Design a binder for this molecule. Sequence first.
Ligand SMILES: CCc1cc2c(cc1OS(N)(=O)=O)CC[C@@H]1[C@@H]2CC[C@]2(C)[C@@H](OS(N)(=O)=O)CC[C@@H]12
Ligand SMILES: [Zn+2]
Ligand SMILES: [Zn+2]
Length: 257
Amino acid sequence: HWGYGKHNGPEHWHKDFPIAKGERQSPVDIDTHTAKYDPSLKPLSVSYDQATSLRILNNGHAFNVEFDDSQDKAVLKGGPLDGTYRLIQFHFHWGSLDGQGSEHTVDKKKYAAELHLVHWNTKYGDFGKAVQQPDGLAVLGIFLKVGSAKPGLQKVVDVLDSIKTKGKSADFTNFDPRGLLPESLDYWTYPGSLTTPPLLECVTWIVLKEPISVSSEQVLKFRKLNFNGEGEPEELMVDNWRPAQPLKNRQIKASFK
Ligand SMILES: CCc1cc2c(cc1OS(N)(=O)=O)CC[C@@H]1[C@@H]2CC[C@]2(C)[C@@H](OS(N)(=O)=O)CC[C@@H]12
Ligand SMILES: [Zn+2]
Ligand SMILES: [Zn+2]
């Protein structure tokens, strides 16, 4: 089964998922000097006030905080998008060291981690149908750097020991994702794909310019999670990120000067 090891990592994915070598794969390196400022781009609209988290799960790749997407309780709109996109879940990608971990890079710089808030286009009814569409998903990417602690992330960090291994899950209600956002919503945007199999090219990527800072203690608790399932040889869950892919015939647009 695909993973992030020497024998089943990103380099091996194309065998079971040919689209890994497609025309609009993600992540990609964001060259801030070649990114085009587009004055017609609109401010991003993040409406997370009625968000309803349900639980946190360790899927063997990363951990997911899921939300109730049966109503327009937490949506992303505006920016480069048309219509409404419902938040279904958020997860992270981190490294074994602070110098690596993010999937997207900025002028080749890699951050310690990357938060992905996944939303699907409401015009497609459900997430399953959305992924089969070129504009079915909108993933808000937010870089994480190590420094001061992020208060809004502590509730997440403290429950990880309860889902240490693959398959484990636990209730996780009333978590507010607004505590995970940086001050500015300035962003870069480009058409891409899921960064893990099935690697479907259904994503409008929106990557925030301003990263959030987390403490070394917080990211350390991320690295204590396991890739393996309970009762198996321990393999720490680290470096679950896919490297940058060829931009090909795409242009990264910036919402700010
Ligand atoms: C709905 C299609 C589908 C998608 C996804 C999975 C299983 C799926 O079902 S399948 N292919 O096994 O029948 C498992 C891994 C999922 C992926 C959708 C995109 C996800 C949330 C990724 O988000 S990301 N990095 O922002 O692109 C992380 C894990 C990914
Ligand atoms: Zn899996
Ligand atoms: Zn992701």
